């Protein structure tokens, strides 16, 4: 078989920047080498073909070059519909091959997180479950630390995070940080504390709540 | 225009089997190959094989030898792949493609079709309204949020007052919980906002047949 | 009898496809089919369309390769004498 690496994984570039994603094949494949766009929502579509071709339709900022092993895809100047990820495609031998593909995102001044934090539900008490949540918003870079302290005690145990994509407007992050504890356990607790630590400031942001009020 | 039509998502248990289809339209059915294309967490994009519609001639990627088994009924216009013994590695979004011979490319894709391997049932969601804490929020905006907790399998759709809401939302993606998912949203509005309008936050979840709404109230 | 002046064509611009066009054969036809064949089975095209239907365009031929073109009407009728073209 013939490997296809894309060694960067994600890209991130300004708007209106000149990008371009590079791609190696294990052995000649002469020139028959395809790129791939497959947006957020799934589709995907054809965008250079035997290495340089433009397809039908796409926009002439795309275009492509390649030296028997050595390949790549240049966008002139990026724009916003262009955020999206890239496969390249040998079609010289069976089996078929791609790369592993090249998601590209947009960077943009740094930005402090806006933090909320919310008690477990009266609803959620009912089911013999507690979840804590803290929603760590509009931020810049992705990278971003939360800590949750419980009576004054750091809890590592029942932590789930999760980050959104990048924001298609502001081209920030969000992340949602999740503390989930029995409904005994949460009772057996006063006090609890997400702390949020970013590189825009030494000091972390701390949002908190007392149970019995 | 052509189009490449694929089944709908699949939730199967480990070791069962699954056939899904892909009906294509707009072109003569037999001038193109059908190809089935893995995209997966763990190995990214791959070609499972191709067959030739009008006589069924199957060219398949060793690698899923053994696992992946395609037919096409071309009387209808549709290619089928059939996966067995299924596992968790299987799990992955699955496309079909059209090329006129393995040298071209793919032209034109399916919509792709979205299978769940697990051993964990079809579960309806809890949805927990989000109130700010009882007792003042620094700041003149506010944010709600909704806990949508313990649904299985994706996806679920959130809103925020049925659409008319739909500045300063985040919707986090899913995480498994205990092999069941959970998902929050946030929403952020003026303080002259909410609680002086109502704000409700809907959930569906085709997969149980669920429609949830939850109006956010005052702790 | 094959479909008569097969006219073969760069569609151009700077891509890659292919424009085939024909005339009825002489004297009800259902269907053209166009072969575009190169040195091996890996580059064989093949492409269909209707009775009323006397052009398409054929993408994606690999560069460099000598490809022949036949028309026929409809399995199918005689072909027509084959064209060549190859693309830089």
Same mark, same amino acid.
């Given at each position: 078989?013939?490997?296809?690496?894309?060694?960067?994984?994600?890209?991130?570039?300004?708007?209106?920047?000149?990008?371009?994603?590079?791609?190696?094949?294990?052995?000649?494949?002469?020139?028959?080498?395809?790129?791939?766009?497959?947006?957020?929502?799934?589709?995907?579509?054809?965008?250079?073909?035997?290495?340089?071709?433009?397809?039908?339709?796409?926009?002439?900022?795309?275009?492509?070059?390649?030296?028997?092993?050595?390949?790549?895809?240049?966008?002139?100047?990026?724009?916003?519909?262009?955020?999206?990820?890239?496969?390249?495609?040998?079609?010289? %031998? !069976?089996? +078929? $091959?791609?790369?592993?593909?090249?998601?590209?995102?947009?960077?943009?001044? =740094? &930005?402090?997180?806006?933090? @909320?934090?919310?008690?477990?539900?009266?609803?959620?008490?009912?089911?013999?479950?507690?979840?804590?949540?803290?929603?760590?918003?509009?931020?810049?870079?992705?990278?971003?630390?939360?800590?949750?302290?419980?009576?004054?005690?750091?809890?590592?145990?029942?932590?789930?995070?999760?980050?959104?994509?990048?924001?298609?407007?502001?081209?920030?992050?969000?992340?949602?940080? %999740? !503390?989930? +504890? $029995?409904?005994?356990?949460?009772?057996?607790?006063?006090?609890?504390?997400? =702390? &949020?630590?970013?590189?825009? @400031?030494?000091?972390?942001?701390?949002?908190?709540?007392?149970?019995?009020? | 225009?052509?189009?490449?039509?694929?089944?709908?998502?699949?939730?199967?248990?480990?070791?069962?089997?699954?056939?899904?289809?892909?009906?294509?339209?707009?072109?003569?059915?037999?001038?193109?190959?059908?190809?089935?294309?893995?995209?997966?967490?763990?190995?990214?994009?791959?070609?499972?094989?191709?067959?030739?519609?009008?006589?069924?001639?199957?060219?398949?990627?060793?690698?899923?030898?053994?696992?992946?088994?395609?037919?096409?009924?071309?009387?209808?216009?549709?290619?089928?792949?059939?996966?067995?013994?299924?596992?968790?590695?299987?799990?992955?979004?699955?496309?079909?493609?059209?090329?006129?011979?393995?040298?071209?490319?793919?032209?034109?894709?399916?919509?792709?079709?979205?299978?769940?391997?697990?051993?964990?049932?079809?579960?309806?969601?809890?949805?927990?309204?989000?109130?700010?804490?009882?007792?003042?929020?620094?700041?003149?905006?506010?944010?709600?949020?909704?806990?949508?907790?313990?649904?299985?399998?994706?996806?679920?759709?959130?809103?925020?007052?049925?659409?008319?809401?739909?500045?300063?939302?985040?919707?986090?993606?899913?995480?498994?919980?205990?092999?069941?998912?959970?998902?929050?949203?946030?929403?952020?509005?003026?303080?002259?906002?909410?609680?002086?309008?109502?704000?409700?936050?809907?959930?569906?979840?085709?997969?149980?047949?669920?429609?949830?709404?939850?109006?956010?109230?005052?702790? | 009898?094959?479909?008569?002046?097969?006219?073969?064509?760069?569609?151009?611009?700077?891509?890659?496809?292919?424009?085939?066009?024909?005339?009825?054969?002489?004297?009800?036809?259902?269907?053209?089919?166009?072969?575009?064949?190169?040195?091996?089975?890996?580059?064989?095209?093949?492409?269909?369309?209707?009775?009323?239907?006397?052009?398409?365009?054929?993408?994606?031929?690999?560069?460099?390769?000598?490809?022949?073109?036949?028309?026929?009407?409809?399995?199918?009728?005689?072909?027509?004498?084959?064209?060549?073209?190859?693309?830089?």
């Amino acid at each position: 078989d013939i490997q296809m690496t894309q060694t960067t994984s994600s890209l991130s570039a300004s708007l209106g920047d000149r990008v371009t994603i590079s791609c190696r094949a294990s052995q000649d494949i002469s020139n028959f080498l395809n790129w791939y766009q497959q947006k957020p929502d799934g589709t995907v579509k054809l965008l250079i073909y035997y290495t340089s071709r433009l397809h039908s339709g796409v926009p002439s900022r795309f275009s492509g070059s390649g030296s028997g092993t050595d390949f790549s895809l240049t966008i002139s100047k990026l724009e916003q519909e262009d955020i999206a990820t890239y496969f390249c495609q040998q079609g010289n %031998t !069976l089996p +078929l $091959t791609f790369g592993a593909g090249t998601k590209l995102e947009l960077k943009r001044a =740094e &930005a402090a997180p806006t933090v @909320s934090i919310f008690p477990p539900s009266s609803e959620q008490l009912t089911s013999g479950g507690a979840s804590v949540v803290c929603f760590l918003n509009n931020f810049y870079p992705k990278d971003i630390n939360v800590k949750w302290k419980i009576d004054g005690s750091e809890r590592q145990n029942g932590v789930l995070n999760s980050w959104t994509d990048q924001d298609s407007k502001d081209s920030t992050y969000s992340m949602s940080s %999740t !503390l989930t +504890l $029995t409904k005994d356990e949460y009772e057996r607790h006063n006090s609890y504390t997400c =702390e &949020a630590t970013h590189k825009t @400031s030494t000091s972390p942001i701390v949002k908190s709540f007392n149970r019995n009020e | 225009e052509v189009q490449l039509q694929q089944s709908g998502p699949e939730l199967v248990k480990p070791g069962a089997s699954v056939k899904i289809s892909c009906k294509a339209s707009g072109y003569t059915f037999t001038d193109y190959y059908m190809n089935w294309v893995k995209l997966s967490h763990g190995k990214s994009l791959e070609w499972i094989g191709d067959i030739v519609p009008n006589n069924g001639d199957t060219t398949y990627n060793q690698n899923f030898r053994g696992k992946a088994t395609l037919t096409v009924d071309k009387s209808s216009s549709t290619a089928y792949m059939e996966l067995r013994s299924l596992t968790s590695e299987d799990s992955a979004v699955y496309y079909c493609a059209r090329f006129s011979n393995y040298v071209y490319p793919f032209d034109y894709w399916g919509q792709g079709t979205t299978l769940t391997v697990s051993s964990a049932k079809t579960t309806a969601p809890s949805v927990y309204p989000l109130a700010p804490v009882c007792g003042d929020t620094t700041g003149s905006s506010v944010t709600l949020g909704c806990l949508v907790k313990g649904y299985f399998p994706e996806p679920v759709t959130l809103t925020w007052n049925s659409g008319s809401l739909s500045s300063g939302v985040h919707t986090f993606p899913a995480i498994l919980q205990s092999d069941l998912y959970t998902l929050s949203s946030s929403v952020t509005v003026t303080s002259s906002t909410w609680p002086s309008q109502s704000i409700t936050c809907n959930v569906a979840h085709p997969a149980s047949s669920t429609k949830v709404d939850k109006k956010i109230e005052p702790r | 009898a094959p479909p008569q002046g097969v006219t073969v064509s760069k569609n151009d611009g700077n891509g890659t496809a292919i424009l085939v066009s024909w005339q009825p054969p002489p004297e009800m036809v259902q269907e053209y089919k166009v072969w575009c064949l190169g040195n091996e089975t890996r580059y064989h095209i093949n492409k269909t369309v209707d009775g009323s239907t006397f052009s398409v365009v054929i993408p994606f031929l690999v560069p460099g390769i000598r490809y022949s073109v036949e028309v026929a009407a409809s399995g199918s009728g005689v072909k027509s004498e084959p064209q060549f073209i190859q693309l830089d």
